[PDB]
């Protein structure tokens, strides 16, 4: 099938370069224009400018012209988004989508964000949070995972590998202190918990860590 | 041209009651003076096929009533 | 550069109504030639990229239900939903590729309104894993409730406690439409252990009295 | 036209 597939998260200190990846599938990439356009953190998006797949000619939105490169590569279908000289306000997140003749924009990819920053990564702790010893009986039963202390942005939280997908809450992130904190909630039937293991599951890219949390009662 | 001496991101907060009773609420982001046109605007939108449009303003004109009469 | 104003800014609206969205551009997107609009509507969920609905200005994608409706020619163009569901809650943005650079609007967000939802309120003591680090959060959920406005209040042995606590809320959530909020309360152990009683109250529209919920920690 | 990627509705001309 077509698909877009970029590159992971990336966390950059100011002054630094990154250079992220988009690889095509599923159509002949040489035969349709790819653009890139970025969306920083809750406001909007705005178009970068597009590479030539054929030509390899990259054309420029002024507001990008200087810092930012497209490039290919085109035997691997892959299309490249360079930022140098990275300041604070690059962080955002990057789509690479590919434009048809009539205009818009077919497929995109699921977009690749970038934090500049100078505070360090650090792997978060992943605490299971069980109902306390004691109010009974609730025909629910609420269930959650608490995500600390932890740098940079994401995590992806899912439950029982992604199985649990209903009554599932995981909220955004809050940062403090350098630090982030996150939380997750899923609210199943008491017939299957403690019967059938709940896990959270939890991923920090930057750290490369997956934390398998099993919630048990206390 | 956007001001860069002076201000205010305002937001007016307008009640849609149309003529059958349902009512929907919309929001416009801008200065004061772009945002109130916006809901005009959008009030003459939804007039061409909800009907004529009054209005009730308050909180300096930061909310707004619009009734369409429908039809 | 072709400017692209769309509004409302937002717009909530009740399950199968007909809500109407409005993008105006700077300049006419209309080819001479082609007769043509290039202007296109997609739409953006929470975490996920943009996806089109709409181009030429009224040429429904492939796969998109006949319930999106594009019009307009010229400066003036609207996208209509005319039985509007909780799958249609998120941003939706027109962009204008007339003439580059292509530009979009700011994006009008779509909530949907519902019956109004008492919260359903958990609250959880640190975990004993945490506690072996010196650290103590009491978390507590407020979720599935309506409207979206919310208060939350801790209370150690009775008292108010303003220090150490950390919001985060859900964006209407895309089954029920109701919203979600995640409260917590970080203390170092010491603290945590010297207190026995904790507690947060919500406050909702849906109740003139705060729903409660706690634990004593001499019963844990 | 002398191109197969376009960007831009203003250039493109009836297919013909």
Known sequence: ?218 | KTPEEPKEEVTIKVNLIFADGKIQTAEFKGTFEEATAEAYRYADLLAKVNGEWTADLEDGGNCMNIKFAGK | DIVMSQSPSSLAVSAGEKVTMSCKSSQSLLNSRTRKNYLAWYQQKPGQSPKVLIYWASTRESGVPDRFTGRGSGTDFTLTISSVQAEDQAVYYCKQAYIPPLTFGAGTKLELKRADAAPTVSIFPPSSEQLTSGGASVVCFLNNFYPKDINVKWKIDGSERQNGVLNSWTDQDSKDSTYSMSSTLTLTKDEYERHNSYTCEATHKTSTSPIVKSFNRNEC | PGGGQIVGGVYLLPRR
């Open chain 1, 1 to 218: 099938q077509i698909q877009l597939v970029q590159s992971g998260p990336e966390l950059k200190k100011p002054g630094e370069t990154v250079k992220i990846s988009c690889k095509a599938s599923g159509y002949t990439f040489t035969d349709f224009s790819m653009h890139w356009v970025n969306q920083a953190p809750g406001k909007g998006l705005n178009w970068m400018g597009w590479v030539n797949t054929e030509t390899g000619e990259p054309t420029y939105a002024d507001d990008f012209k200087g810092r930012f490169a497209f490039s290919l590569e085109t035997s691997a279908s892959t299309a490249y988004l360079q930022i140098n000289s990275l300041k604070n306000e690059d962080t955002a997140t990057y789509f690479c989508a590919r434009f048809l003749l009539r205009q818009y924009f077919d497929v995109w990819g699921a977009g690749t964000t970038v934090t500049v920053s100078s505070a360090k990564t650090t792997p978060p702790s992943v605490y299971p949070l069980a109902p306390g010893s004691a109010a009974q009986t609730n025909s629910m039963v609420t269930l959650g995972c608490l995500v600390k202390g932890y740098f940079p942005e994401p995590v992806t939280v899912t439950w029982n590998s992604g199985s649990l997908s209903s009554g599932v809450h995981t909220f955004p992130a809050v940062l403090q202190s350098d630090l982030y904190t996150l939380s997750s909630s899923v609210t199943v039937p008491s017939s299957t918990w403690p019967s059938e293991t709940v896990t959270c599951n939890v991923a920090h890219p930057a750290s490369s860590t997956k934390v398998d949390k099993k919630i048990v009662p206390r």
